[PDB]
Write a protein that binds this ligand. Structure first.
Ligand SMILES: C[C@@H](C(=O)O)N(c1ccccc1)S(C)(=O)=O
Ligand SMILES: C[C@@H](C(=O)O)N(c1ccccc1)S(C)(=O)=O
Ligand SMILES: C[C@@H](C(=O)O)N(c1ccccc1)S(C)(=O)=O
Length: 358
């Protein structure tokens, strides 16, 4: 590999792994249309299985970027509009607080205080309906952002309804397959089980537990190679042959809301490049990232801005991931680990690497 890339990546990631006690890690740097891969440690400690370029990691909330692009593709297909009322796609949602809550609000966490999690007690479809029917907003729509699986997860479920496809079938056929992400999964198939890393939490091997809206909010598993291809697809949407997917990728990077110095896309979040590293590093801490914050509407949304830092953190109980890229520089990074270690450590490492290369 180019020595600059080798050195920049190793000098940043080796200490990170040591400090954070990460059992296994894979990193991709995407530099001018080419990926460079690096791996460390163990996918399975007990079985002594190393992390390889074929190891599957749980992406956790990085999955929301796939959800956002799938939703973008459904808009491009003319199947949904972000301006449509939620009730158009879920007519059983008759409670009055839903008047004025659109798919845009669901997609961007601005419905007015939908909770981070769907309650664990929600086990059935009828339970889910009751939950949303009985939910009371703290805020008028389009006024406060509160990061929420119950928000974007419902967006993903509704976005695919006109197609008649299940969320998994829509994702596979409309996103994974056209982009040749052949080792990216909502449900890991038996053929891939030998590559599926264990997550580690408090010294125990764990995989993500089933939950309502899991696929839509945090349920994708992928390899470092497929994730590098995902970054390249989001860096160069016009190279995608399928018109609706090409458009959907771009719609996910449109800037719909601003809070502080960040802009909310569909799944993706964006800041102007060059960024203040303190703002992305400190801003990534859950003390800010999961907080309720006022939003300014961007009226109308800015189309995807080339000079942006585009990124997403995400975790499950046993995994921690980060993806960031800068379209104007054709530059990106993917960091996948089988421990949920703090967001700011991820973002700090990514910025050190990308800043040294840009
Ligand atoms: C960088 C550029 C491209 O596709 O070559 N564009 C882009 C802008 C934002 C995000 C991703 C790509 S584009 C289609 O505006 O010219
Ligand atoms: C906060 C969020 C994430 O970091 O991806 N979630 C999480 C919460 C606790 C532990 C691990 C992850 S999630 C996937 O539940 O939304
Ligand atoms: C992330 C997930 C998991 O099992 O890994 N968990 C979860 C549990 C209930 C609802 C949503 C997510 S978690 C946060 O306990 O680790």
């Amino acid at each position: 590999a180019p020595q600059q890339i080798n050195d920049i990546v190793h000098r940043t990631i080796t200490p990170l792994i040591e400090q954070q006690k990460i059992p296994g890690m894979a990193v991709a740097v995407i530099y001018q249309g080419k990926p460079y891969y690096f791996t460390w440690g163990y996918a399975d400690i007990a079985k002594k299985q190393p992390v390889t370029q074929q190891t599957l990691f749980e992406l956790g909330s990085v999955s929301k970027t796939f959800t956002g692009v799938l939703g973008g593709d459904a808009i491009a297909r003319g199947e949904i509009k972000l301006s449509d009322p939620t009730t158009k796609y879920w007519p059983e949602l008759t409670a009055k607080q839903w008047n004025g809550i659109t798919l845009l609000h669901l997609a961007t966490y601005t419905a007015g205080g939908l909770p981070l999690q769907v309650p664990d007690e929600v086990k059935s479809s009828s339970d889910l309906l009751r939950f949303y029917q009985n939910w009371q907003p703290a805020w008028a729509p389009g006024t406060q952002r509160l990061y929420a699986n119950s928000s974007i997860g419902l967006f993903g479920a509704l976005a695919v309804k006109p197609s008649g496809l299940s969320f998994e079938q829509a994702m596979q056929t409309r996103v994974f397959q056209p982009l040749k992400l052949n080792h990216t999964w909502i449900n890991v198939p038996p053929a891939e089980e030998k590559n599926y890393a264990w997550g580690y939490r408090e010294g125990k091997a764990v995989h993500v537990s089933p939950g309502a809206l899991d696929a839509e909010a945090y349920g994708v598993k992928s390899t470092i190679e497929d994730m590098a291809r995902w970054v390249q697809s989001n860096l160069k949407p016009l190279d995608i042959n399928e018109k609706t997917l090409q458009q959907g990728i771009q719609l996910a990077q449109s800037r719909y809301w601003q809070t502080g110095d960040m802009y909310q896309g569909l799944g993706w979040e964006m800041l102007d490049w060059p960024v203040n590293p303190d703002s992305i590093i400190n801003g990534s801490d859950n003390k800010i990232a999961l907080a309720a914050r006022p939003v300014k509407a961007i009226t109308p949304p800015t189309p995807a801005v080339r000079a942006s830092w585009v990124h997403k953190t995400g975790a499950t109980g046993g995994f921690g991931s980060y993806v960031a890229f800068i379209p104007e520089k054709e530059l990106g990074i993917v960091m996948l680990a089988n421990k949920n270690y703090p967001n700011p450590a991820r973002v700090d490492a990514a910025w050190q690497i990308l800043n040294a290369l840009q």
